[PDB]
Design a protein around this ligand. Structure first.
Ligand SMILES: Nc1ncnc2c1ncn2[C@@H]1O[C@H](COP(=O)(O)OP(=O)(O)O)[C@@H](O)[C@H]1O
Ligand SMILES: OCc1ccc(Oc2ccccc2)nc1
Ligand SMILES: [Mg+2]
Ligand SMILES: [Mg+2]
Length: 265
């Protein structure tokens, strides 16, 4: 159906490991969108064709206000192209570098919108496994949207692919290569909640080796300015034992979330 000829390409929106994302307009409808470009050579060398398929299948079938739409794809002997919903206000990562820290109102609203999208996901036994600020995008009303479904699977699951970049958002069971389920996303939620309020992830370190050590041991501490309610929610999510982590309903009706969030469940 679609081909490159159907689009005018615009400015770079961002770079990923494989993805190079560009602003683009469809010639006949003037529809504005984002075009994620992958290089087949890079994809074959790394052996991650299966991740691209999963991204296309899981993300085109899902429909939720807090999850980024994927519309289609095509490909041309050198490259693969995913056709995405464009997110006008950028990434949560950028917003965090801009402000350094989010206040309690901003943090709880984001956490609510995440828990809504995740709950809709888990209801089809879909788990993301790669929740981090670089993959959280912002709509035209500032609403949070989950993107980058490349690492997502159906539960339960083991890991078959090499962990490439940062260990910072991954739970113990997953870095130790053990078996994992829905509860991995709840751990990611707790890492993110801490990073929003503090300005850096709770297990951050100088080397891979040491980061690995702080995560499996669950060594983190709070700065003085983090209130009692935030500490309670974050301590509940960052439990070594998956089964001791809360359900998403518990997060969404936790007293500190309801007191500060400006969006409902
Ligand atoms: N739909 C989009 N709208 C705006 N920017 C985007 C969009 N998709 C990706 N980006 C930017 O490009 C980056 C890489 O996209 P991503 O899908 O995460 O690629 P990768 O799978 O290689 O990580 C994001 O971190 C973001 O900065
Ligand atoms: O699920 C159907 C589907 C969708 C996209 C897709 O892209 C490619 C194309 C070429 C190589 C690897 C992946 N391959 C299959
Ligand atoms: Mg990404
Ligand atoms: Mg990816």
């Amino acid at each position: 159906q679609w081909a490159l000829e159907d689009f005018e390409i615009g400015r770079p929106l961002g770079k990923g490991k494989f993805g190079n994302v560009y602003l683009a307009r469809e010639k006949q409808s003037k529809f504005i969108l984002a075009l994620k470009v992958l290089f087949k050579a890079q994809l074959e060398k790394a052996g991650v064709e299966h991740q691209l398929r999963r991204e296309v299948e899981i993300q085109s079938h899902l429909r939720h206000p807090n999850i980024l739409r994927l519309y289609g794809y095509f490909h041309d002997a050198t490259r693969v192209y995913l056709i995405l919903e464009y997110a006008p206000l950028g990434t949560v990562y950028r917003e965090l570098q801009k402000l350094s820290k989010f206040d309690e109102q901003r943090t709880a609203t984001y956490i609510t919108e995440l828990a809504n999208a995740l709950s809709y996901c888990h209801s089809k036994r879909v788990i993301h496994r790669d929740i981090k600020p670089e993959n959280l995008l912002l709509g035209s009303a500032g609403e949070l949207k989950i993107a980058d479904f490349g690492w997502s699977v159906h539960a339960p699951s083991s890991r078959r692919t090499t962990l490439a970049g940062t260990l910072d958002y991954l739970p113990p069971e997953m870095i130790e290569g053990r078996m994992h389920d829905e509860k991995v996303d709840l751990w990611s939620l707790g890492v993110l909640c801490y990073e929003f309020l503090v300005g850096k992830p709770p297990f951050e370190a100088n080397t891979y080796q040491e980061t690995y050590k702080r995560i499996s041991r669950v060594e983190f501490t709070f700065p003085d300015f983090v209130t009692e309610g935030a500490r309670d929610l974050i301590s509940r999510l960052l439990k070594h034992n998956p089964s001791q982590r809360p359900m998403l309903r518990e997060v969404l009706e936790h007293p500190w979330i309801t007191a500060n969030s400006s969006k409902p469940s």
